[PDB]
Amino acid sequence: VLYVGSKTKEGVVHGVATVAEKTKEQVTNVGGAVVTGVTAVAQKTVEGAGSIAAATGFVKKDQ
Amino acid sequence: VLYVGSKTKEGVVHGVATVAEKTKEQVTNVGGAVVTGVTAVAQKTVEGAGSIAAATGFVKKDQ
Amino acid sequence: VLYVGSKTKEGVVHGVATVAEKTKEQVTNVGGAVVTGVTAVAQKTVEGAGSIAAATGFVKKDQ
Amino acid sequence: VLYVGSKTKEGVVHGVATVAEKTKEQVTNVGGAVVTGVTAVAQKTVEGAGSIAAATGFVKKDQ
Amino acid sequence: VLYVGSKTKEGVVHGVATVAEKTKEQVTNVGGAVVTGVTAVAQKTVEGAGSIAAATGFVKKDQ
Amino acid sequence: VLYVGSKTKEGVVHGVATVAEKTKEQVTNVGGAVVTGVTAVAQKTVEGAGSIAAATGFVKKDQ
């Protein structure tokens, strides 16, 4: 018996309840990035960069 | 018996309840990116970059 | 018995309930990208980049 | 202008999300009453008795 | 302007999220009453008795 | 302007989130009453007795 890498559980979300009562919600953007409202998200990345709510700017590599 | 990589569970979302009561919701954009409202999302990436709510800017590589 | 890569479960979403009562919802865009309202999404990518709600800007590679 | 009994809201249920993951569920009865699983119920009774999940016994009025 | 009995809100339930993960659930009865699992219930009774999860016994009025 | 009985709010439940993870749940009864699991319940009774989770015994009025 080996059971190598067995019965695992990774990058998991479960059993979540959520209520949101918002009368108004404005998001104005005129520049770079804006990220909002990220709920119950799961990921598993192998041999790579893993981002989930990454608001980056502008990569301005010139000459 | 090996059971190598067995009974696994990865990048999973389950058992989620959500209520959202919003009277108004405006999103104005005139520049780069805007990401909103990302719920119950799962991913598994192998040998690659994995992004989920990544609002990037503008990659301006000149000469 | 090997059971290598067996009974797996990856990039999965299940058992999700959602209610959304929004009286008004406007999205104005005049620049780059806008992503909204992404619910119960699953993906598995092998040997590749995997994006799910990625609002990118404009890749302006000149000469 | 009277607006007597106006814009009322009574005996109301709205905006409800629910998830139930039950692997087994047995209900054995051999006597009186059993009531189970009552969700999102509304009632308005006028000039009367109003019951909603009332498990009564046995009304044994003899001579 | 009277607005007598106006813009009222009574016996109301709203904006409820619920998750229940039960592996087993047995209810055995052999006598009187059993009431279980009553969620998001609303009532308005006028000129009457109002019960919602009332498990009564046995009304044994003899001679 | 009277606004008598106006903009009221009575017997109300709202904005409730709940998670319940129970591996086992048994309810055995052989006598009178049993009441369990009463969530997010509202009532308004006028000119009457109002009970919500009332487990009574057995009213044995003899001669």
UniProtKB/Swiss-Prot annotation, chains A, B, C, D, E, F:
Highly expressed in presynaptic terminals in the central nervous system. Expressed principally in brain. One of its GO terms (molecular function) is phosphoprotein binding. Its main location: cytoplasm. Cu cation binds at H14. It is found in: Cytoplasm; Membrane; Nucleus; Synapse. Phosphorylated, predominantly on serine residues. Phosphorylation by CK1 appears to occur on residues distinct from the residue phosphorylated by other kinases. One of its GO terms (biological process) is receptor internalization. Keywords: Acetylation, Alzheimer disease, Amyloid, Cell projection, Copper, Cytoplasm, Disease variant, Membrane, Metal-binding, Neurodegeneration, Nucleus, Parkinson disease, Parkinsonism, Phosphoprotein, Repeat, Secreted, Synapse, Ubl conjugation. Signal peptide: none annotated. The keyword Ubl conjugation applies. Residues 1-31 are annotated as: 4 X 11 AA tandem repeats of [EGS]-K-T-K-[EQ]-[GQ]-V-X(4). Sequence repeats lie at residues 6-20, 21-31. The keyword Transport does not apply. GO terms for cellular component: actin cytoskeleton; axon; axon terminus; cell cortex; cytoplasm; cytosol; extracellular region; extracellular space. The modification Phosphoserine is found at S51. Changing H14Q: In PARK1; no effect on protein structure; no effect on phosphorylation of the protein; no effect on membrane- and lipid-binding; increases oligomerization; increases fibril formation; increases secretion of the protein; impairs copper-binding. Soluble monomer. Homotetramer. A dynamic intracellular population of tetramers and monomers coexists normally and the tetramer plays an essential role in maintaining homeostasis. Interacts with UCHL1. Interacts with phospholipase D and histones. Interacts (via N-terminus) with synphilin-1/SNCAIP; this interaction promotes formation of SNCA inclusions in the cytoplasm. Interacts with CALM1. Interacts with STXBP1; this interaction controls SNCA self-replicating aggregation. Interacts with SNARE components VAMP2 and SNAP25; these interactions allows SNARE complex assembly and integrity. It is linked to Genetic alterations of SNCA resulting in aberrant polymerization into fibrils, are associated with several neurodegenerative diseases (synucleinopathies). SNCA fibrillar aggregates represent the major non A-beta component of Alzheimer disease amyloid plaque, and a major component of Lewy body inclusions. They are also found within Lewy body (LB)-like intraneuronal inclusions, glial inclusions and axonal spheroids in neurodegeneration with brain iron accumulation type 1. Parkinson disease 1, autosomal dominant: A complex neurodegenerative disorder characterized by bradykinesia, resting tremor, muscular rigidity and postural instability. Additional features are characteristic postural abnormalities, dysautonomia, dystonic cramps, and dementia. The pathology of Parkinson disease involves the loss of dopaminergic neurons in the substantia nigra and the presence of Lewy bodies (intraneuronal accumulations of aggregated proteins), in surviving neurons in various areas of the brain. The 'non A-beta component of Alzheimer disease amyloid plaque' domain (NAC domain) is involved in fibrils formation. The middle hydrophobic region forms the core of the filaments. The C-terminus may regulate aggregation and determine the diameter of the filaments. Neuronal protein that plays several roles in synaptic activity such as regulation of synaptic vesicle trafficking and subsequent neurotransmitter release. Participates as a monomer in synaptic vesicle exocytosis by enhancing vesicle priming, fusion and dilation of exocytotic fusion pores. Mechanistically, acts by increasing local Ca(2+) release from microdomains which is essential for the enhancement of ATP-induced exocytosis. Belongs to the synuclein family. This is Alpha-synuclein. It comes from Homo sapiens (Human). The chain holds residues 37 to 99 of 140 of the full protein.
